[PDB]
Amino acid sequence: KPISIIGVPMDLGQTRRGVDMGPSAMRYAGVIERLERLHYDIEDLGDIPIGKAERLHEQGDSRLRNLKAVAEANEKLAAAVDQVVQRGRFPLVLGGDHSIAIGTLAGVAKHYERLGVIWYDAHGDVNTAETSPSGNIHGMPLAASLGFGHPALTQIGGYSPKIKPEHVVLIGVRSLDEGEKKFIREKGIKIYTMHEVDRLGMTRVMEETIAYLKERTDGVHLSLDLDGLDPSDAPGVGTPVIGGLTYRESHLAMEMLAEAQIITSAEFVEVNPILDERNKTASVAVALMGSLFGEKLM
Amino acid sequence: KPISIIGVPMDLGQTRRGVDMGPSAMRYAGVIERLERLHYDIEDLGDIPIGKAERLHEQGDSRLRNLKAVAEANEKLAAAVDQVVQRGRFPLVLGGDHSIAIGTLAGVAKHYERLGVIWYDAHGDVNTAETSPSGNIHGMPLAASLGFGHPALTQIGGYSPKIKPEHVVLIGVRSLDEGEKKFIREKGIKIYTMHEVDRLGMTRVMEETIAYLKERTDGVHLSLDLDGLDPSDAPGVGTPVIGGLTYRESHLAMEMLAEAQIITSAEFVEVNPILDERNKTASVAVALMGSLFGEKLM
Amino acid sequence: KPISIIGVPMDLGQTRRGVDMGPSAMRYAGVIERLERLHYDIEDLGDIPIGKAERLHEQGDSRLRNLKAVAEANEKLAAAVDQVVQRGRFPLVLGGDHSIAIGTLAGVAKHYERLGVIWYDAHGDVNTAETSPSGNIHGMPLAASLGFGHPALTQIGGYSPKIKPEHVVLIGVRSLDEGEKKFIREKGIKIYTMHEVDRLGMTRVMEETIAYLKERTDGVHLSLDLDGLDPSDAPGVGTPVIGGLTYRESHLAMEMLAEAQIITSAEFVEVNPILDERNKTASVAVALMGSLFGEKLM
Amino acid sequence: KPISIIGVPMDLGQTRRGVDMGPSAMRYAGVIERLERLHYDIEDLGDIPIGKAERLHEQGDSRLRNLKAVAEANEKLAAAVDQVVQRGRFPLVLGGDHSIAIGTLAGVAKHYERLGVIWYDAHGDVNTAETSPSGNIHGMPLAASLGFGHPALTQIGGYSPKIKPEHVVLIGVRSLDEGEKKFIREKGIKIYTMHEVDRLGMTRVMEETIAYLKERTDGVHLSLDLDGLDPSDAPGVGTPVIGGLTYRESHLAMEMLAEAQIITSAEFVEVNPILDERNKTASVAVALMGSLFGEKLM
Amino acid sequence: KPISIIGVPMDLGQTRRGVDMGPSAMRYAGVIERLERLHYDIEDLGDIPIGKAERLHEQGDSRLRNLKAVAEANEKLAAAVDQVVQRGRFPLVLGGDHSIAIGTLAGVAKHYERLGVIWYDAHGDVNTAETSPSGNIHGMPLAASLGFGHPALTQIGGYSPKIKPEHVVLIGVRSLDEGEKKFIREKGIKIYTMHEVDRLGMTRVMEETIAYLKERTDGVHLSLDLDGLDPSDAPGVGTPVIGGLTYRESHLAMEMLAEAQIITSAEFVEVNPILDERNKTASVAVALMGSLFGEKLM
Amino acid sequence: KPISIIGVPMDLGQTRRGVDMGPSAMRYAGVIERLERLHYDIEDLGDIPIGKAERLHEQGDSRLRNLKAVAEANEKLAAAVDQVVQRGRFPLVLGGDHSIAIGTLAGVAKHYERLGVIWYDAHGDVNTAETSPSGNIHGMPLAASLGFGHPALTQIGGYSPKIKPEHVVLIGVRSLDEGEKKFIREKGIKIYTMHEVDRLGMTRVMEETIAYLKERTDGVHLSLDLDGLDPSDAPGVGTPVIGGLTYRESHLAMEMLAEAQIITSAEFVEVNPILDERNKTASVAVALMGSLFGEKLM
Ligand SMILES: N[C@@H](CCCC[NH3+])C(=O)O
Ligand SMILES: N[C@@H](CCCC[NH3+])C(=O)O
Ligand SMILES: N[C@@H](CCCC[NH3+])C(=O)O
Ligand SMILES: N[C@@H](CCCC[NH3+])C(=O)O
Numbered sequence A, B, C, D, E, F: 001k002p003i004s005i006i007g008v009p010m011d012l013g014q015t016r017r018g019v020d021m022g023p024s025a026m027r028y029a030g031v032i033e034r035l036e037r038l039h040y041d042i043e044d045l046g047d048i049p050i051g052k053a054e055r056l057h058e059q060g061d062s063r064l065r066n067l068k069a070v071a072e073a074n075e076k077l078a079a080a081v082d083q084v085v086q087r088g089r090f091p092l093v094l095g096g097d098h099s100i101a102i103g104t105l106a107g108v109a110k111h112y113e114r115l116g117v118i119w120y121d122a123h124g125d126v127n128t129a130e131t132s133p134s135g136n137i138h139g140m141p142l143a144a145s146l147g148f149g150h151p152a153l154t155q156i157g158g159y160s161p162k163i164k165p166e167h168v169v170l171i172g173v174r175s176l177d178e179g180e181k182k183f184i185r186e187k188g189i190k191i192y193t194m195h196e197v198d199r200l201g202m203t204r205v206m207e208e209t210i211a212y213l214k215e216r217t218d219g220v221h222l223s224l225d226l227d228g229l230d231p232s233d234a235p236g237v238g239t240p241v242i243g244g245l246t247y248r249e250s251h252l253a254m255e256m257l258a259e260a261q262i263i264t265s266a267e268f269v270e271v272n273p274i275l276d277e278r279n280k281t282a283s284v285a286v287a288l289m290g291s292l293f294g295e296k297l298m
């Protein structure tokens, strides 16, 4: 299927400057060339225009920083993603902080009966204004997409929820807020923390994940946050957490997904050039995209 | 069960300065806070007073450096640990070179019919004056606790041996003196060298270890030497050996032990701030303690 | 005097991706805040729109890569800078590869009888299509501004030359192409290579430079290329050259310039986040700007 | 003159754990051996007992954290230093955060008509409860010794002030709070910030400093804070500030002082093993002490 | 069986200087000492004399650089290896770029009915003048040994092919040229790329490899290219490729081979001191050789 | 004057393996290319054949390790150097441990009435069997050349002494053995330790050195030991000593010597690839050679 790249230079879902440079860092790491090589009809649709954050004092509220700007940008993203899907192309979204998942999922989900999601990350991203210890929307996209959160975020695209809890698989988690542990537990979301990765190995984790979703969804969205990988492998992220997934485990994960042919949409987020060591993180993301799209060693 | 912390600023069992700073580096790495967060009744009993070593030429055996001072301090530790166990609390001992295991085991062992020991280390620590290539008592604690060595060491606490060979499991070993290989072989001590860890995986090694001990002991003491981990993960150790256990394997190990609920006492040793990179090693110890005491990702 | 910031996300004057991210890396390194603290009326005019380069095979000269797009963008910059000077504000230009000096000098020069230029760099940037070993316009801005090169470059702003050779002082030079050595020699441009910096000391070099220019110009433009500093201090540059100016020498230089009160415009260029170590280079630029604008230790 | 070493494991004048390990890190870096080699009658008097900080809520006040504990410890230090001086020995104090300077100066000053002070540091340490942005007493010792501050600190030793402003020379300063700049300016304290070091060179700075003091004091106290050196040379400090004095400049400074024979008392502070890279900082301090006490290359 | 060491200071099969220093870096890393310790009758036969590259204008070597010189050196190597085998000694060949495999296999193969080969590498080394993107013979030894390539290479030793495709097992591959992918695919060579290593694990991979070869060969040659290990573990190699085999995986591999007792000859290649970090790579090689030759942890 | 390169792969004058690799690491760092570029008639005469160390039990060398082998190699070197000088060519000797200076000076000195020597080093290299704390001849070449030491060393070339103490200038010294301090002091050798470099600066030091020698010699030999530079700049050396000469200071030194046109012969020694970081040290050497031979920035 042809691919359309949409850059979302988003940094409103958080407070550290630099993550808005993620889309072009990956471009500069050679994302187009890498995929053309695999014989893809790749198209770069450019970047979604992101506004300037409204003063904290007139925004949606403290627990939801930049609510309106984040919401607006996500609306635009959702429209772009929708069009791409309508054109029969695979939407490959580049971030940008994780709050963009709200827009991506909004543009995609409506096209599937039962959309599944693989959240490759160090965090669960299932906070709400109530549970968030930061007020940063980049830590709420999964919860919002499940229909839990401020309506300005849960209603992006004019519908909700985008996916069901039983259709989500979290992988690589190692940093959950108390509220989130409760949410995951209560909503019954399938999760493989680093404990399971270390205990079962990435091969079993991926095998179980693929089987689980293939068995109950009609499309699967890969929402990959680079902080899911260990900071030594992906140093350029806003909220790094040690003891993460290795460079090799991540390639095995992408290769298995490619092999399974279940990924129908994808986004690579949280790449921050300003916190990186010579674009290493954007490079990992591009290499991972290569594997996901079929690049093989033999 | 409530926890009591006992610091043993010991460096007499070896020759490199700095390991005596281990207890406070771990305190500064936040050991109390980490455990309080887990809802424990944690108490810090302070540090055992360590004497000064007498003139080497006045010492009566070069194969046992600082014997008197090491024995003396270990007696004190044994008393302290005994007191804690008597009070119904779990003794968490912080080192300090590994020779302190002699005191810890002396204070604990007497309270169990068949105490088991998990020696997580790169070394066997089973030397004697006869086999030691260094004369450093920090390389003799396991042998001494098994009743093999100078009576000044084997009789701490007024009894011997503290544990039986068939109740010991060595994990992470990769540096054994010839005499030690003979000792382990002949005494029939269960050992998983890096070869087994690589070949079987930490999960299998830990499963077998837990099953083995749970099946024949009434308490299990964890004697964790930070040099068991790779020097890249735990740089601050006096006798580093490459090709060690990773940060993740160690967390998995602690997590499985916690899960099994078999650990009845523990000690974290060989942390040396002076050979470290910004307290990294002390921090690893604290994070591993978190996992040992039940800290979970989900 | 109030300051106006103009970002020029330019990478057309060279071939390595990333230098276009320079303006925002410096913004993220806190340029506005640093200057506001000094009590300045600082204004950020945004970024000059940079077009896309036309097909190389369609371009009419390989010795002048991206000539049209580079000229076009420089025209825009010149207009913007002119506007700022007309408004009685100091133009602070952020790059972006060094080819932007053509636009900056074009907008400024017209306002002075004898504009002086301090070129703090590892290179002379005095190549022409004839002498350039690369065809990269970023290595030609000083020559072009002196009226030497392709008219598309020498005529930006509708006039030429912008400055006279006798009013230029090169500092920190350590990498000159043969043609450039000839140019500097023949045009009689004052130059302090690393040999002079080492031999005389930065203090003497700066004293002589300030006296020289103050004695014959009515305004002085500081064109600071971060690659003038040693790669260990400023790693994020496209063409690093070892044996450069230290962090301290650069602060002393800026401090002496501020003290002299001769700088009437300035530009900080060649910052590339993608070749950097956690925005270090952009940070150095911001700290140097602080000193240039009067920041003092006591 | 014979030397007496007094360790002051102080961390109450600040908030980061670890600086209390400074005295023994330097001991472990071999301070005694280094000085014995120079044929000194060196004596180690041990460490001053430091209490536990009183709860913020019952202490002297917010702007003066741990006031009573700091004061008390300084009283003890002053008594110890006084005795040493009375015994005709040179007092060499090892810290420990800089607040210990209050005790050292109290024990020394009373023995001189006009005691001079060389404050080798990145900071001025002339804050008061009024000007302090932290409430940390380690940033007030110089001001307190000049008689400016809370009486609990200004009256240590039963007298004040300990020295006169005109008898103080600050060297290496590069991080002053606004209040401090005012204090220095108004009290007329001689200061050589990094600007002067870069501009005049360490040789001239030291020459001027030595002449200045030799010309008006009857004894000179060297209060050396390791953060005075660049963080790359002395990484183990609580409040590092970039762009500092090099390893060589510091040795030249010590060698010139030794040569001048004007230093009558000294203290090396802020060494923190826990923030260091393999005791590098304590090692620098010991090497510097070697130079100060006469160690020469030829 | 007694061991004979033959150094082959070869760098003709490639273009980066330094790999000719491989043999002595390993000797300096203690290869003799390490093997003597295991009680071997080790003999060092010295180095094969290698020639100088003749003028390109003279002889042609665009697709086959240094053909004559590489061929002549390999003839010498083949003779030396043959003699050692004839003397009933195990030939341990130290390189030197991988083109030396042509000579090693030529001297060994003729002595076995069905010689097997384990090619531990990041590359396939199965290029031909036709498929090679570099013209570097160090990327053609496996193809040449299989009887595919220039006769000057395929006929070394006076016979061809040296081994059969079905008796070859590639391990650690992660960088194959298109032509090589086709070759491996068509020739039916057994291969475990990093995908298989990650998916099955090194234990499984080695078990399958040993059973596969033991089941159909009468001897097995280990051709170990240090670049098979990740660049972080073996930095000193001419063509590093990230995402490689770890230091522990490699030890496990060597330990299992020793255990299986199937290796009848071996070579360690591509060690380049000039691209290394303090002989780290030569050190890993010596360590791996120790394991291969029976060194055990217990 | 035409240049002849003579490699001396010597490691007999010391005990750490690797320094014998110095000559080719420099060749690989591009020494020929660098000098040809300066339009020199450069010739590479190859390497002096060096022997193997004979059994300690056989010949004695505790205070004079490898005496016979070091002496014999130096005789060969002396002949080679003599011939080159006889042919009217400048002898450029590449080491190899510093003991080779004995052979270089032996081949050169006889051709001058008053040969001067600039010993750029961290050490004095003026030990004798009596004063040497190591028995390593690489720490005795200067003393031996001055006619002090074992006759096997002092008589190389059939004459002694090669030079006079008053014609020697040591630069960069920071590590002298007590006996050496006495020797230098008593022999009246001119020396600039790091204290003088720091105090006077490299410009002053070189000016004084050039005027001193130019005023009383008819030729000057540059004996440059890379360990004279700081270990951060030249990491690959057998006996590094911190607080050394910077990369820039060394270039200035070479630039001033070239300018003075007083150097008539030279040798670059102690380069050890095996203790280096990617040939960095050999690279610095080649760079310094370029400056020495006239390479200029302008
Ligand atoms: N859970 C944290 C971190 C989220 C990071 C998202 N990129 C929060 O909600 O603030
Ligand atoms: N086995 C060695 C090293 C022991 C290290 C103990 N911490 C010895 O006995 O000396
Ligand atoms: N002088 C070289 C390098 C210039 C670098 C400019 N930023 C050239 O003209 O290509
Ligand atoms: N000036 C700052 C830092 C002082 C650091 C003293 N060691 C303060 O007063 O908080």
Ligand SMILES: N[C@@H](CCCC[NH3+])C(=O)O
Pocket: E098, E123, E125, E127, E132, E133, E134, E135, E136, E138, E139, E140, E175, E176, E177, E239, E270
């Ligand atoms: N496959 C590449 C790299 C080979 C590397 C061999 N050591 C080539 O043939 O050029």
Ligand SMILES: N[C@@H](CCCC[NH3+])C(=O)O
Pocket: F098, F123, F125, F127, F132, F133, F134, F135, F136, F138, F139, F140, F175, F176, F177, F239, F270
């Ligand atoms: N002075 C010491 C070190 C000399 C190093 C010579 N390269 C010695 O003679 O052993």
Ligand SMILES: [Mn+2]
Pocket: A121, A122, A123, A225, A227, A228, A239
């Ligand atoms: Mn995350």
Ligand SMILES: [Mn+2]
Pocket: A098, A121, A122, A123, A125, A138, A225
């Ligand atoms: Mn996320």
Ligand SMILES: [Mn+2]
Pocket: B121, B122, B123, B225, B227, B228, B239
């Ligand atoms: Mn151990």
Ligand SMILES: [Mn+2]
Pocket: B098, B121, B122, B123, B125, B225
């Ligand atoms: Mn141990």
Ligand SMILES: [Mn+2]
Pocket: C121, C122, C123, C225, C227, C228, C239
């Ligand atoms: Mn430049």
Ligand SMILES: [Mn+2]
Pocket: C098, C121, C122, C123, C125, C225
């Ligand atoms: Mn430039």
Ligand SMILES: [Mn+2]
Pocket: D121, D122, D123, D225, D227, D228, D239
């Ligand atoms: Mn300070």
Ligand SMILES: [Mn+2]
Pocket: D098, D121, D122, D123, D125, D138, D225
């Ligand atoms: Mn201070």
Ligand SMILES: [Mn+2]
Pocket: E121, E122, E123, E225, E227, E228, E239
């Ligand atoms: Mn390879």
Ligand SMILES: [Mn+2]
Pocket: E098, E121, E122, E123, E125, E225
């Ligand atoms: Mn290979």
Ligand SMILES: [Mn+2]
Pocket: F121, F122, F123, F225, F227, F228, F239
């Ligand atoms: Mn030396």
Ligand SMILES: [Mn+2]
Pocket: F098, F121, F122, F123, F125, F225
């Ligand atoms: Mn030397």
